[PDB]
Design a protein around this ligand. Sequence first.
Ligand code: COA
Ligand code: COA
Ligand code: CL
Ligand code: CL
Ligand code: CL
Ligand code: MG
Lengths: 427, 427
Amino acid sequence: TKPLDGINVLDFTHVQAGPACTQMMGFLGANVIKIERRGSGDMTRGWLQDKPNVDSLYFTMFNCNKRSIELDMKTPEGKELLEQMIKKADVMVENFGPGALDRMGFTWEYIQELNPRVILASVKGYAEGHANEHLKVYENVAQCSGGAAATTGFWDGPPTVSGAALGDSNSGMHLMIGILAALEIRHKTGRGQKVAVAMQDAVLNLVRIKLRDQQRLERTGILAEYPQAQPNFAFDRDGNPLSFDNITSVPRGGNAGGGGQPGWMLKCKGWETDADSYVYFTIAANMWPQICDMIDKPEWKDDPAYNTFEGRVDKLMDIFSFIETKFADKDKFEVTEWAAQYGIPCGPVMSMKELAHDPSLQKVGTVVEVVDEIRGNHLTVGAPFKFSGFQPEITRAPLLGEHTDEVLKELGLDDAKIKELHAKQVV
Amino acid sequence: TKPLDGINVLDFTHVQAGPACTQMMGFLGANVIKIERRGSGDMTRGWLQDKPNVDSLYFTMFNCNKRSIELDMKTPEGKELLEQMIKKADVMVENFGPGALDRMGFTWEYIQELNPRVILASVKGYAEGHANEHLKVYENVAQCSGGAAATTGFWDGPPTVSGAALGDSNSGMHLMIGILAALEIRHKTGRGQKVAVAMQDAVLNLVRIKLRDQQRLERTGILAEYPQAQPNFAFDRDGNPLSFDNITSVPRGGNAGGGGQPGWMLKCKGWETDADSYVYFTIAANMWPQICDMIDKPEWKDDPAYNTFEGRVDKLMDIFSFIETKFADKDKFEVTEWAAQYGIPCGPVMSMKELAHDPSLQKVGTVVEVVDEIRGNHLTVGAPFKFSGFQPEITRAPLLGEHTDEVLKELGLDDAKIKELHAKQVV
Ligand SMILES: *SCCNC(=O)CCNC(=O)[C@H](O)C(C)(C)COP(=O)(O)OP(=O)(O)OC[C@H]1O[C@@H](n2cnc3c(N)ncnc32)[C@H](O)[C@@H]1OP(=O)(O)O
Ligand SMILES: *SCCNC(=O)CCNC(=O)[C@H](O)C(C)(C)COP(=O)(O)OP(=O)(O)OC[C@H]1O[C@@H](n2cnc3c(N)ncnc32)[C@H](O)[C@@H]1OP(=O)(O)O
Ligand SMILES: [Cl-]
Ligand SMILES: [Cl-]
Ligand SMILES: [Cl-]
Ligand SMILES: [Mg+2]
């Protein structure tokens, strides 16, 4: 059995955040009916297509395990169809602009009237009640709003976006938690709820560690493990040394560990020509003697200035600069194995090329080849949660309106009524 | 009333990923009993402390809504206590190293014997069956393993770690989806399941958009929305030109749009002295006329060299550069307000200082002042999902072993036999 078998999702979502959520629900067995606009549908269909007039990889990688119906929702017959669909839905999911779903006659209060059991789940930019509640926010804007950009990158460079979808997919995964939580409470109350996740808040949740640091900084005036705390290492734009003397908000720390276990990104053989020929090396406290054996400096093992975090904290960059010199003639996989024979936490920067074609990730179903007989096969990311009694069955993304009549017949409409709806341009 | 009221969680978790998961379950009403090592407890207690001998903000911000019991689980008496606790639990959660729980004698097989309803939830570095399934992984190593580091930062710099916890907290939130999914099937089956999330997999899930890009790159040889698509824009450290002629794995694109429309991080008034005086500004294809009005370039509206995404490919970075000149005398908030007049997606880089003291985030319960009469009040991030039917009630993190006797009483032990366990150094 799959977790969400028999869960009917009425899916209004577009682009990334909403569709990530509903696709992942689909992977876990939910019945996802994607409502799309007549003729055009989800904006991702035509977004950076790799072949003319074929749905893009943006669309296919976020819309597997879904059925598509075209619908003009601002028509009387379309609103009627929607009322029928809401009555059969367990969860409605949308990521329209604020007020958009109200404006086409479907307020939460009306939705409750139609179906007391339905859950209404929304992706928002800022939370309801926020001063900026009405600002449009997408991916990198949300990374900026939630504190990630300010704390990502280097002290002598700009705020930096993550390549990971901290705004979009992260918000979608957060909303999926909200939806599943609402399903849990419905078992007890018998009633549906409204649940919403703002992109700013999804980002903030993942930068909890930086709000820890902001309070530490306010309380103590220093973050001793940050590069700026090492005397005469970090320099500003003009060339002078940086310190916490004049830093009152969590700064960018380059490739520092971000917690209580210091680390850095270290060059390996080929770094000039291979952008991903690097490892990350972490100094775990219990693993310090093991590091001294690999690096071969046994003086440091018993030196109190070197064998304690508090001793090490004021010369982290000096130790990292040295260890990096030991990796100059070894590729990232050779450095990783050389550290691994001392049990040390060291790992390679995996390239997207490596990841896309990695045997292990395909063995465990995390990278999945989708059998798409219409467009040709493509890779996608599968379910990142692995269950003892269940395996996802990923099926290819729908053509625009491919399942319109199938879905209309399920509502109970006869073949003459379907032809009328097609002729009247509602589906 | 709350989604997880009456759900008993046996919580073995420590450090970041596991405790984030169980804390958020706590926020949604779960009864979380956190098992800790005697004397030292969860090592976050003593990491990055702001006051000597007070539990660190690292611990308190990850362990609200929990009770703490001290337990040596490598004693016959400890293992017997676990068996009793497992029988009362709905969910067991752990983020020890691979195999650790099995070596204690609590394999999934034996756990099922003890309690056929209980769900076992794990965070590990890599998935079971992966070549690296036995590796111990920390935050930035997981970012490196999952494709984030390789695709974050600039083309002429190193792979860059994200300030957001893509590895740890993100994995915890994913595990929460798995746990909630297992709770949903248990209503049908009456049986618990094992659910596991690999840190690599949680990262890769958020990097799905870069797997879209890898395939596009493999299929077409170019990513037209990336800075390197602009001829003579991007260069490596020795001045060699970077173009997609020689790029075979998704490159770092600086502050480019990712899964959003094209954008960039633009300087605002004060950028020389304020590290966070920037906005993110998006050039969405359907907003070009508005942008031309804003920056007073009417001649750009009807010029095919400027008015389509395709025409802008060879000059987009020049356009960003020119737009940025309009922000020289305006702070990030006035730039944001100006752009919002046109409906253009644009927003400020919010500093951690600005976020920690923002009234809106405290109004909507996303930043929360926790009442801690022992340690003094502190801020935390609350639930990122907002519900119509309930509000989290966040309560302070437990002192080490604060609830040991309280918890033992509930297990059916009386005063004479808990004293023996104290005596034997079991609790
Ligand atoms: S990971 C970050 C990704 N970044 C982006 O997605 C940036 C690009 N995004 C956008 O430009 C918009 O967010 C898009 C994807 C165009 C969606 O815009 P809306 O949220 O307004 O959704 P729609 O464009 O689909 O809706 C426009 C108006 O029309 C109504 N409507 C939607 N769908 C239908 C159907 N099927 N039938 C009739 N009407 C429909 C909406 O309610 C909306 O109404 P307004 O009253 O004009 O707001
Ligand atoms: S979010 C970033 C952290 N990453 C993860 O959460 C990924 C999963 N966790 C891990 O890989 C490890 O837990 C990390 C975080 C890398 C730390 O590694 P350690 O070197 O600390 O190894 P363990 O956590 O597995 O602990 C070592 C042994 O100690 C035993 N143990 C823990 N707690 C107790 C108590 N209370 N009583 C008795 N024994 C206890 C573990 O079972 C483990 O046993 P071994 O069999 O000796 O490994
Ligand atoms: Cl989106
Ligand atoms: Cl974290
Ligand atoms: Cl966008
Ligand atoms: Mg003008």
